[PDB]
């Protein structure tokens, strides 16, 4: 219960970069696991969307002058080489890697990444259902 935002967000982002080069059996463990922690800690919801960057119609044209220039000055503040987990600036960065993961070659893995466009309706996500899958069990259940 104690951990910070910066402590949890470092593990969510580092496992998210790790999903880029991973077997799909290792994805159906991480997507539930990232889904649990953001539901546990909703302060780190800011990396799934920064709503300063959303575009309303009912915002001022002078802010359009601001919102154009503000997006241009973005840099990714995340530092992979930093090993102190609270010190890494994963909170100030998003995680595009899970958004890319919605486009996936397997459907059921592409299904679970599509949770993150839908709302956070439930919490108890039961990882032991989704934890142990294998290349054998992916093939054996697919014809089944």
């Amino acid at each position: 219960t104690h951990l910070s935002a910066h402590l949890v967000a470092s593990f969510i982002k580092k496992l998210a970069r790790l999903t880029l080069e991973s077997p799909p059996s290792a994805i159906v463990t991480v997507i539930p696991f990232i889904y649990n922690l953001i539901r546990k800690h909703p302060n780190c919801m800011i990396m799934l969307h920064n709503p300063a960057f959303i575009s309303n119609p009912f915002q001022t044209p002078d802010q359009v002058a601001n919102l154009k220039t503000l997006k241009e000055n973005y840099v990714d503040p995340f530092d992979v080489h930093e090993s102190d987990p609270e010190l890494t600036h994963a909170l100030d960065s998003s995680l595009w890697e899970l958004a890319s993961l919605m486009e996936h070659y397997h459907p059921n893995v592409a299904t679970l990444a599509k949770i993150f466009a839908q709302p956070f309706k439930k919490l108890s996500y039961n990882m032991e259902d989704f934890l142990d899958w294998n290349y054998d069990s992916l093939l054996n259940a697919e014809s089944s």
Partner: peptide
């Protein structure tokens, strides 16, 4: 590319 951070939860 843009490489803008996402607003998936909208």
């Amino acid at each position: 590319t843009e490489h803008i951070p996402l607003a998936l939860q909208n």
